[PDB]
Paper text:
The complications of data collection using these twinned protein crystals were similar to the small-molecule examples. Automatic cell determination failed, but both RLATT and CELL_NOW clearly identified two domains in the case of insulin and three domains for glucose isomerase, and their orientation matrices were used in SAINT in the same way as for the small molecules. TWINABS produced detwinned HKLF 4 data and several HKLF 5 data sets. Both substructures were solved using dual-space recycling methods in SHELXD. PDB2INS was used to convert the .pdb file to a SHELX.ins file. Both the insulin and glucose isomerase models were refined using SHELXL by alternating with model building in real space using Coot.
In contrast to the interpenetrant twinned crystals of bovine insulin, here it appears that three separate crystals grew in contact with each other [Fig. 11(b), right]. One site has a much lower peak height, which was interpreted as a mixture of Mn and Mg. Density modification and autotracing of the inverted substructure in SHELXE identified 352 residues in ten chains. The second Mn site was partly occupied by Mg.
Residue numbers in the entry:
A (entry chain A), B (entry chain A), C (entry chain A), D (entry chain A): 2 to 387
The structure:
């Protein structure tokens, strides 16, 4: 019955089920949750673990005595439940000091502070066993053209990531970084707005092997992009270090719906790709239970994330294993797409009259791709109408 | 009076002013143009040169005798006018054989043909003096999830670009490649949909130094992205090999309006950045005169592209040179954004109590960025209201 | 097995399966179809009937002898198959004369011609038994601000529709009009861009009872709008005279995918609403088989439209009939939403201290809406995971 | 120098300059403002007046003694400055009780309360001299399909507006209502999402003459719609009771930038239309100074709204008065667009062989519209490049 177990590796941010429902036009609709109670509540649902921002575990401005007791209580809930902490991250967006950014703030002292805050939490992340450290530069960007020279800001962004990579190397940590793109909100435009921009930026770091992406379903969809396509490119690059799952109904504010909501067909093709590719990291949900809900609806929504992943996994596997689909894939030439165009090499291609001079372009053009039958088989599988 | 001269390097595709106005719901509204007459007509307007697809110079399926006479006539118009041909490209989208792509077609024979067609035109491009060879993979992509394994397709795309780079190296040509991203249309989703995705892909080629981007204003805006930001990232990467200028009114079909139309403020900030950065390549217009127009309106629209570039150039230069704006930039800390965050190095940063333990975050947060005054100075400059 | 029969009332435009695959960057990939063969082919698939533009039945500029033989051949295919023609429409977009519009062309003679062309086809539509006459003003609009005074254009649009309503009244026809909104493409902005704008405009006609809407799934989604919501408003207004079904993957060019493709969840909620409301008109598909397909894929895609409608109909009915869902609807107060707010009347409301002075807003606010559990039941039903 | 005076009728919501900068990912960056100080500060800038939500003048849950003193202090600032209060509105979105809506909440008691809260503030609005009472139903809508039957919700919405119209009639007030559309945010989809949907809904009210629209620039642009077009339709309907001015950079979260920011060309065409139409209501700014700013930047941003309106007013007037533009308008047939298509009547049109049988469609089609020259004259005027 699509019941999750910890071996499914489902994880959740403390800030997700813990979202109090404050939006830019409304006050909180739910009380804050003790992280201890979310660990317990999630473990009961079948989750594998939790993630946190530094401020989602230890309230900003804590004395070290308080910090110690916050951590201690959290550590006991993990031990009580068997939950893990595979990823953590820094809040560089909530406090007003970060109103123009953390790593790319125009104010140099803020940039320095953002790094000092980030490094403190990396140490804590390692202590709690995280393998991935995410950065979402939600305040990096601008509302107006003169406010941000983006060439200078990317210099400042490279600087920061290079320093964090020097730091983890100096400490001998095994943790790796994952940049989480978003195209806008809360800034008018955010730097590194998509998976492609983040991938490209990483290739300009001193130690590129230490940084990957953490793409979020709804964020690429906020640019009207195909999320499964961007995940394929991240996988092709060897850079899918982590993944954020949720739903989004098109180009609008970041909704962070429960996974499977939003674009259901894209959710199907995403799961198909993650499972085909053997992605083995956490299946992490970054989602807000809608503020219409009380705490029972919070946990229902969380359960739904996991349930929908496992239904889509079953339907995609059944699609890929159906001999009628395999035949259709053959009919649509997907096997040909995986064979080299010219393993025979450039000269042989140049000398191959069958590639140009005697190529029958009209017979090739007349050959239908048969993609609509293939896609209606995929639809039939998704809906259990086979 | 904002009169262009060839030294402004303005160029135009033959397919732009030559667009007959056929759209997906309407027939042609203008006759086809002889490329000779467009070269002459553009030179009279002050353009520096023209670009072409192979099929926009030599009709598909020409005998070599016909090909020779087409080229000869074009060459004479160039010589008659002093016009140049700085860029050329391949039509891998119009013919039905390319209905599932050229380089990433599922059919291997089509992929081979696409390369054979591309290489033939590279030789011609070199003969006519082009320094940049553009690729727009407008048919590379899918309408449905099962039709295109994107991992395999990027393998096929890398293959193709690697082969074209082996070819130009083997011939000793100096020409370089520029990939032109577009997120969708005519395919439901197009591969390498944005500047970031193209930049990232190039870093996976055998000879990355040979490939840059040719970003188009309207295409990044079709993903709701900030075009000046993406140009800054391309410039930061050292990869702005060429630029396509036009206008776009938001997220919708590719309009290819005359430059300055669409998002006027973004046009201002683009020109500001190109001129600040000392971009020295062609200012190339990829635009469709609307099909409401007759041939006089075609040439009016072309003239307008150039005029609007030169007005925005003047207003941006005046903005950057105004001592009141310089002071505002200082007030908004843009100078600080250009200074290293931590040239003193990681350890010094770690030991700097002013970066954390004794950082006054409340006083930093209280400091306004003054970006609205800066932006109203930019507005006043753009509108000539100073 | 979700097999359609004519009693399902599925209809298709001749221009849908007959689309030759010409897009704004590519030539045709399929030959044209004889309307006779599409009637036969669709009847074999289980369709109820077909619709046409005047130019999709009789080629533009036909002699009346030719027109007669075209009609005669079509009439025989209808009789041979039992197919019906419930709707027809005018092509006021393909010919270059309509480059600035038909009814709102700036040129008065074109406006007159557009009406003369429209009235000729209304007579033919009546002869073939249509009950609905659609208008899609795809060329009505502008690319630039000065080109179209929209106040004057709406005067010209009202004029035209008023004249067509006088005409059908004068002839004693029973046919009714349906305006099909689209927000853009082929014009930069199209007038009456959404269901709401069309509904509002109709209330300004001389005979409002004669005009409704024909909303198309993909067009409202091209404005990022909720198609089921707009259909509910059209139904609430008593104005859903006809409906166009297809799919659309977000805000981009009009894709006209096969129904069920695009936004699958929205397709579910649409079918739920049409069936709940007892909509009894044609279930009309306005769709393009992708130009990757040959004619077998054309018919596969058409079959898929019908299949997906019938699967979604079954799943929605099962949702609405499930006692667990009924209970959830009760828990989410949907029954309360259908009860008058204040049947007791204004004064009683004013005097009801329970409505303000003694209203417990905190207890009301604390009551969760339970919408996430309700929606996961809807998801479970859609996917057959109950 | 584009200095505003109260006769320009510029108004501002207390919540605009008073926005503390709390966004869905960040805390406040500015303290709250005393409404008294905003009235004074705005009057010094040249504003005509202010508007308020009930909760933006009197903190929620005030004793009547407190309410009295809040009002008294506000009244004295108005008298001290000569500022007016032309519009007011109800906060039916911030308090958690309104998490599923006010007038269309599923909970009947909340719907009753929303009306009781609305009516209390209408009385206060009248006392302070407002002529327009706005409703923005920002919580009316849904995130999921089953949560909201939209047919029932529109019944509940009609009910509420009908009751408020009975109330103001019963009291003999002269105030009129204006519905402010928004397509989404904070709900996933908001009911009456555009100007067209609101216009259409009003025609279903018992007393339609009492309700108009208050369209907001950024909200229609959040649906990718042309704001000047929707204003023209509202003006054509006689329903532009009020207007909200700001800027928006495309399809994304509601930015509420200072007017003239966002889409500058659309701002030009809007002002052109308001001034051409002789719109005489308040020019009301609904805008957020970005949270990067301190209070000096708040007032700079407010000043900028007014400045940009007055620059665009000058440039549009100069466009409309330029004899070269008048000639171009004549060349593009805008005069013809304003002449009836068929004042000669239906029969005369039917009998006019020049309208069909002898219409030269090819010569008509060959006539260019000359819209690009017209639009480059508009551009030259906007930029002061004539
Ligand atoms: Mn998100
Ligand atoms: Mn995330
Ligand atoms: Mn383009
Ligand atoms: Mn281009
Ligand atoms: Mn369509
Ligand atoms: Mn349609
Ligand atoms: Mn707004
Ligand atoms: Mn507003």
């Amino acid at each position: 019955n699509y019941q999750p177990t910890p071996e499914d590796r489902f994880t959740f941010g403390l800030w997700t089920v813990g979202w109090q429902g404050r939006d830019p036009f409304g006050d909180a609709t739910r009380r804050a949750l003790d992280p201890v109670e979310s660990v317990r509540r999630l473990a009961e649902l079948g989750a594998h673990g939790v993630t946190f921002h530094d401020d989602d575990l230890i309230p900003f401005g804590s004395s070290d005595s308080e910090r110690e007791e916050h951590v201690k209580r959290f550590r006991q809930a993990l031990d009580d439940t068997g939950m893990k902490v595979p990823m953590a991250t820094t809040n560089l967006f909530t406090h007003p000091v970060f109103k123009d950014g953390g790593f790319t703030a125009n104010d140099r002292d803020v940039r320095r502070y953002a790094l000092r805050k980030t490094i403190r939490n990396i140490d804590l992340a390692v202590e709690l066993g995280a393998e991935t450290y995410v950065a979402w530069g939600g305040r990096e960007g601008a509302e107006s053209g003169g406010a941000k020279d983006v060439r200078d800001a990317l210099d400042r962004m490279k600087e920061a990531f290079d320093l964090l990579g020097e730091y983890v190397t100096s400490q001998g940590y095994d943790i790796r970084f994952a940049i989480e793109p978003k195209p806008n909100e809360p800034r008018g435009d955010i730097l590194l707005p998509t998976v492609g921009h983040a991938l490209a930026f990483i290739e300009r770091l001193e130690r590129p092997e230490l940084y990957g992406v953490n793409p979020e379903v709804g964020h690429e969809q906020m640019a009207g992009l195909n999320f499964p396509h961007g995940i394929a490119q991240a996988l092709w690059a060897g850079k899918l270090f982590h993944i954020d799952l949720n739903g989004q109904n098109g180009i609008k504010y970041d909704q962070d719906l429960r996974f499977g909501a939003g674009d259901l067909r894209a959710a199907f093709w995403l799961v198909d790709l993650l499972e085909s590719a053997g992605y083995s990291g956490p299946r992490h949900f970054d989602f807000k239970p809608p503020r219409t809900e009380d705490f029972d609806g919070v946990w229902a929504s969380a359960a739904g994330c996991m349930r929908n992943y496992l239904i889509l996994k079953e339907r995609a596997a059944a699609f890929r294993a159906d001999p009628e689909v395999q035949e259709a894939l053959r009919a649509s030439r997907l096997d040909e797409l995986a064979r080299p165009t010219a393993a025979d090499g450039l000269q042989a291609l140049l000398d191959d009259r069958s590639a140009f001079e005697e190529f029958d372009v009209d017979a090739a053009a007349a050959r239908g791709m048969a993609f609509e039958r293939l896609d209606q088989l995929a639809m039939d599988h998704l809906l259990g109408a086979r």
